[PDB]
Amino acid sequence: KVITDQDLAKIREVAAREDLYSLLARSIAPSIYELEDVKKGILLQLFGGTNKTFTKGGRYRGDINILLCGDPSTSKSQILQYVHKITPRGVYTSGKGSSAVGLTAYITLVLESGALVLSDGGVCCIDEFDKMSDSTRSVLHEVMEQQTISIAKAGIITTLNARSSILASANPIGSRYNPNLPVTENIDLPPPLLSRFDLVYLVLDKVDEKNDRELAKHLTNLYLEDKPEHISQDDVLPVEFLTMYISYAKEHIHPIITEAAKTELVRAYVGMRKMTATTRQLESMIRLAEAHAKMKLKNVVELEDVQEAVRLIRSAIKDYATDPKTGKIDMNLV
């Protein structure tokens, strides 16, 4: 394919650092400037929740689905490249490149695999998500909710497993974010599909001289050398070691809910609910908190993890800057 006690010592020693969460996040995509919250959310998608199966009452998904939405030139697609190369298994694809059959499975009498099936247990990166038709996007409802694919065609009828995490990229209606429309109307996905993402990010091309000088200095510094040694930050982890950390934590660590975490989750859900938050906001909060716990090599979910899960959800969709009654965003607060 393309362990030792020293590796365990290194992993345990790194896990004791105070700046661990920021260190890991800024190290998944070293040359990309800022976008810290986006990097953090992607890191938690890499770790994932915990998988659960009951004797009866079913099984519950550990995987996280993320949507990146906003202005052009904001470097969304560049981030999808890093995720596609970091993940052990996965696929990158485009909206105009995909059919309903190609995305799931194909009759040929034999059955054949599509992208979401090849990507099982990994991450499936979908770019230009706003270009594919309502017919093709309707296929994703069942696979995202259940993590299974049911088929019933001439001579073949069966169900297949798809433990696949989706990372999506799109631009708003009108192709540049319009502040005179509410956020849900700018995003323009129908509610049954928009309800299935754990995190939704707004990223905006806001002009600012302070930001622009730093961005310009960062991009122009890459052309001072033939094959650059330069990198955005002094301390980042090598890709190999980072992969080792993530892989080990996925295999050995399995956090559980503490009573304290249960009380905070109930309180937080009632807070978002009483005023719109659906029942899926609760489950996605649980899943994000579990992902945060694995990343610290803990066996228990605690109050700190729940509060981080809540904070990241509020930060992603620019809620603090949102008018609570009209649903428009004040661009001055960004």
């Binding site: 009951f54 004797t55 109930v266 859900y269 009632v270 609910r273 029942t279």
Partner: protein
């Protein structure tokens, strides 16, 4: 059957607790009245009954159907609703 969110704190506070319990304990939360292998044996037994419509029930059915027709006078209520109501009553008697 039409399902609606109907947001209410007194329901949300309980529903959230139920959901968090399912993620906190795997098997323990549900505590059903019967075992599945018990329930299937009961359902197999029940389907052997072939109940018969009582005289008073025949008199009562036309009154209830007239009430539905006057409510109707929304999908328009046809003779098929009476036939369906008879089916449901057969199933209810069989359940008992």
């Amino acid at each position: 059957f039409v399902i609606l969110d109907d947001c209410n704190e007194k329901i949300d506070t309980e529903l959230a607790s139920h959901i968090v319990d399912l993620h906190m304990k795997r098997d323990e939360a549900i505590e059903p009245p019967f075992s599945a292998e018990q329930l299937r044996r009961y359902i197999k037994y029940a389907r052997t009954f072939k109940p018969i419509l009582t005289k008073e029930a025949r008199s009562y059915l036309v009154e209830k159907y007239k009430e539905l027709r006057k409510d109707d006078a929304s999908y328009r209520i046809t003779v098929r609703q009476l036939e369906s109501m008879i089916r449901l009553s057969e199933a209810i008697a069989r359940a008992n």
